[PDB]
């Protein structure tokens, strides 16, 4: 009845819900490419039944009060590290960025409330995304922010949330989805791992996010992670409106080399990369000819430090999409670290996907304890190595 972190531990587990879903079995190897089941031509019109005393409510995130209720649900009940020491603390303005990209739909912001008190106790979301998977491009959704209030857990409310968002996506004619999780489910198309780059090692060690390496003093740890005060790449500057087309061009061409990627329109590129303070940072390299040849980006996602008397929060930057054509990726990411340090971040996180393994050890990242499993719903295809995953979710 409890989740699994490893593929061998998950293989002895029973998946009463996921056995009912159009996903491959954990045990079988996938030899084909295509949908698990044909598209449905008649879709259930009625919402799935919730347990007595709870009701569906679609959340208007343009209402400041409602957005704050969602902030609070996530702030108090969303994903923790496996030791229950830190919890994601997505900000209201970040949530609006992640949940209202181009094509967002109100019915896909799927809340659960207590009938009597109106308290928000559950959420799940879908946003539309065009996804390139091996040799197929298809319209899908990305599922994120699945959250059940701690007091409502282990009562089969999450399967109801999954079925209800599935139904609402089916009604719009979409039959595939992509999603990620730290737990093992049937069946990962790719397995990634977070790595962490200390920026403020003293704070990270004090709050036990990080620990002193074997036979290393704090003084040595400070010198080890020390960074230059300014970046080194010539012509590095924040992305501006005039850069939207070339950033779209660079990204589109760069992503062709991977096997699971988004296909963004120019409007989606504007949404996902145009800088917004405390949400998304994008820096381009404009060379001596005035041409933009590279860019780096990272998003802002702090965590709550639970039950700590002094340090309440950790400011974390997450590597987003980094595109190099003239500047070495190593130099780009070195400058990303310098920029994050300048902007007050305590740690810089990056997955081992795309080409990130080429710089992780060199730039003094340390391996994390969390896997990031990538999944497709209703799509059969062979799994891929982390290096071929070219998709980053919020």
């Amino acid at each position: 009845q409890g989740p699994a972190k490893t593929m061998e531990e998950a293989s002895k587990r029973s998946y009463q819900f996921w056995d009912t879903q159009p996903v491959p079995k954990l045990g079988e190897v996938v030899n084909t490419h295509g949908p698990v089941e044909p598209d449905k031509d008649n879709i259930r019109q009625e919402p799935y039944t919730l347990p007595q005393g709870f009701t569906w409510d679609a959340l208007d995130l343009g209402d400041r009060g409602v957005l704050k209720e969602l902030y609070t649900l996530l702030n108090e009940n969303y994903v923790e590290d496996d030791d229950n020491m830190f919890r994601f603390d997505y900000s209201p303005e970040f949530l609006l960025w992640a949940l209202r990209p181009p094509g967002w739909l109100p019915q896909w912001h799927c809340g659960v409330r207590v009938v009597s008190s109106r308290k928000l106790v559950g959420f799940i979301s879908a946003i539309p995304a065009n996804i390139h998977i091996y040799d197929t491009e298809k319209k899908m959704v990305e599922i994120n922010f699945l959250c059940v209030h701690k007091k409502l857990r282990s009562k089969r409310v999450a399967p109801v949330l999954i079925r209800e968002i599935t139904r609402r996506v089916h009604l719009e004619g979409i039959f595939q989805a992509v999603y990620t999780a730290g737990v093992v489910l049937p069946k990962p198309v790719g397995t990634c791992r977070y790595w962490h780059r200390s920026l403020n090692p003293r704070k990270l060690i004090e709050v036990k996010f990080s620990h002193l390496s074997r036979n290393m003093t704090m003084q040595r740890t400070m010198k080890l992670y020390r960074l230059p005060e300014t970046p080194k790449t010539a012509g590095l500057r924040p992305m501006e409106t005039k850069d939207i087309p070339v950033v779209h061009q660079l990204l589109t061409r760069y992503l062709k080399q991977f096997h699971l990627t988004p296909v963004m329109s120019q409007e989606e590129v504007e949404h996902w990369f145009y800088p917004q303070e405390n949400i998304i940072d994008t820096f381009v390299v404009e060379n001596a000819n005035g041409e933009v040849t590279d860019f780096l980006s990272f998003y802002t996602l702090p965590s709550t430090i639970m039950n700590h008397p002094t340090h309440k929060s950790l400011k974390a930057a997450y590597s987003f999409y980094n595109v190099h054509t003239q500047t070495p990726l190593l130099d780009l990411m070195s400058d990303a670290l310098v920029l994050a340090k300048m902007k007050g971040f305590d740690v810089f996180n990056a997955l081992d996907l795309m080409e990130n393994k080429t710089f992780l050890e060199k730039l003094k990242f340390g391996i994390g304890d969390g896997n990031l499993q990538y999944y497709l719903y209703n799509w059969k295809c062979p799994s891929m190595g982390a290096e071929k995953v070219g998709l980053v979710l919020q």
Binding site: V79, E80, D81, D82, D83, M85, F86, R87, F88, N144, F145, L146, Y179, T180, A181, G182, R193, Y194, H196, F209, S210, H211, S303, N349, G366, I367, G368, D369, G370, N371, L372, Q373, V392, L393, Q394
Partner: peptide, 8 residues
């Protein structure tokens, strides 16, 4: 992506 990691 619904996975909270910290260094091993």
């Amino acid at each position: 992506g619904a996975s909270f990691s910290k260094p091993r």
